[PDB]
Design a binder for this molecule. Structure first.
Ligand SMILES: [Br-]
Ligand SMILES: [Br-]
Ligand SMILES: [Br-]
Lengths: 353, 357
């Protein structure tokens, strides 16, 4: 198969698990990949950064991830993301040394790289991934496309912006693709992802329908929870100050999101059309459907939904981030990609080595 | 058998990085209160209970590994999980306890009394008891007010004497009668402000690491403790509102002496800090962190102590403890803070012995 066409394997080593993707593709007259297709996909648990960094454990792990794969003898890119970013460099190294050692003990995979990518790298790949699926990279874009990734541990935002010397180089990326020259602002906020974020608001009664950990009760009210969360976004990470002045000067024509927001907006408790939403509505539906409901009655109506308990918080969190953080209007359309299309950022690795 | 002439209990601390079994002997005084409490077995394992698969085969393996080699059998057991389990929703917790309840009923050597996730406030109560037990300040009619601060991994606790107050929630107050004396306490836990969860919000702050430390975003550490302190204070006060809740109370109910346990013991007794008499001041802690870690060259510093795996955080932690105690609790920077040394192995579980219901 990978004799007539190019293939690569990309491993997303995320906090909850590692996901192998194998892609085929051809290459157009600009030396850019086209007709990119995923031909093998496999996830295992737990996350790489949570296991013991010795040869016996990593061999098991990698063997479990790769042993059943039907395509051998291709290049492999090992990219770990937020979960490894929480470890200090010296813990990390222990993992990469064993990894380097495992790959040298065999010849079916050709390791090209193994590293922890930054959130700014991840944000670049998010952008490419989404635009590739929209088919807006080939054409000379008259419309500005912004991408927001609501991840477990970090959140990413990315949008067109011409080079700006007042602003750090780690926040900017120049690339040339399908013969076009592109300049993008990229920012990642480590610690503002929804898993990590949630840990500062578990005993906030505004954010739940609900037995809290301190034994108090839920008494949900979405606008209150928005303000709690907004404290973290803006008093701590200073999202407003870094992002709003840049969007005002470089406005975006269309917003896309990926990550958890796709899963929330397409659940049974929410109703949106055309795979898009607005903030005022998201916040409203959360407030009426979750925040002001009786937990007993709403849990009874959907046992076996293990995420429904958080939908008051996440509603309020998305609104805080997008509206009070990034400064977007509450009535602005935000498109979200549907879970079933399985778009993820790893496809951007294919486009940008 | 040892536990035939004396009373014994097992207390399992199931924290976020591991679970730790403690078996205690003790005798009982004429007030029905335990005395001469001694740890006769101690064992830890990893990882934390809340990170494993909640099914029989995994828990069986976990519990067996924890309990198999213990030389004392046939005693009551208390299984108390702390912050790590509090991060999970109830419905995930339950699965753990069902498999646990099941495991204990398939054998007869341990007599399970209780298995639950305790609240921060329960934990705070046991922190206070442990320390005062070790100080021997419970028996005697205390003229002096002792406060305790616990700097844990996922939460922080504070506790100190305060008479009942109907304007303040019930969950934050505790009445206890012990060695025949009546004691009223204020207890509070700040879930998310422990040093592990806190640090996750500051990893890309250059002010909080040694010069040239490699931050995850690829920028460089450029250390400055006062700045790092202000960044952390924002989380203490704008998010958790520690100042609002705790300074008005300490003003109207002052503490004569402060004790801390947890991570501050490990920082303050490391090679890079110098404190006498197992006590410190916040002004000196911050100053030593600033000079001995924040404004140092990372590559040389890390050369000097390779194999110290915590050093890289000492700028941040110095600043964080100062933020908490001074800008959060409102303590004076020059006030003496006593810390229990690591080598005494004092922990909170000894409080369980002293308080059952
Ligand atoms: Br709690
Ligand atoms: Br990062
Ligand atoms: Br000094």
């Amino acid at each position: 198969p990978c004799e007539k066409h190019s293939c690569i394997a990309v491993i997303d080593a995320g906090s909850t698990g590692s996901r192998l993707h194998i892609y085929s593709y051809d290459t157009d007259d600009t030396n850019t990949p086209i007709h990119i297709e995923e031909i093998w996909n496999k996830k295992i648990k737990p996350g790489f950064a949570s296991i013991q960094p010795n040869s016996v454990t990593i061999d098991a792990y990698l063997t479990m991830l790769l042993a059943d794969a039907p395509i051998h003898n291709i290049p492999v890119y090992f990219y770990a993301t937020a979960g490894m970013r929480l470890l200090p460099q010296s813990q990390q190294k222990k993992y990469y040394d064993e990894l380097d050692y495992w790959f040298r003990q065999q010849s079916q995979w050709q390791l090209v790289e193994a590293k922890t990518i930054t959130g700014n790298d991840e944000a670049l790949f998010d952008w490419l991934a989404v635009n590739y699926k929209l088919d807006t990279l080939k054409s000379v874009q008259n419309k500005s496309v912004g991408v927001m990734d609501m991840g477990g541990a970090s959140v990413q935002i990315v949008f067109p912006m011409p080079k700006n010397a007042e602003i750090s180089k780690h926040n900017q990326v120049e690339l040339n693709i399908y013969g076009q020259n592109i300049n993008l602002y990229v920012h990642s906020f480590l610690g503002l992802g929804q898993t990590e974020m949630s840990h500062q608001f578990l005993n906030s009664p505004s954010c739940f329908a609900y037995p809290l950990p301190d034994g108090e009760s839920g008494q949900g009210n979405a606008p209150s929870c928005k303000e709690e969360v907004t404290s973290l976004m803006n008093s701590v990470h200073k999202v407003n100050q870094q992002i709003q002045p840049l969007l005002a000067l470089n406005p975006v024509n269309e917003w896309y999101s990926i990550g958890g927001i796709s899963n929330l907006a397409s659940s049974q408790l929410f109703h949106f059309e055309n795979s898009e939403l607005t903030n005022q509505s998201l916040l409203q539906q959360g407030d009426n459907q979750i925040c002001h409901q009786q937990w007993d009655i709403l849990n009874g109506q959907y046992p076996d939904d293990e995420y429904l308990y958080q939908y008051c918080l996440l509603s309020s969190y998305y609104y805080a981030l997008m509206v009070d953080g990034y400064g977007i209007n509450p009535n602005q359309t935000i498109h979200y990609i549907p879970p079933e299309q399985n778009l993820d950022w790893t496809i951007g690795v294919v486009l940008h080595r």
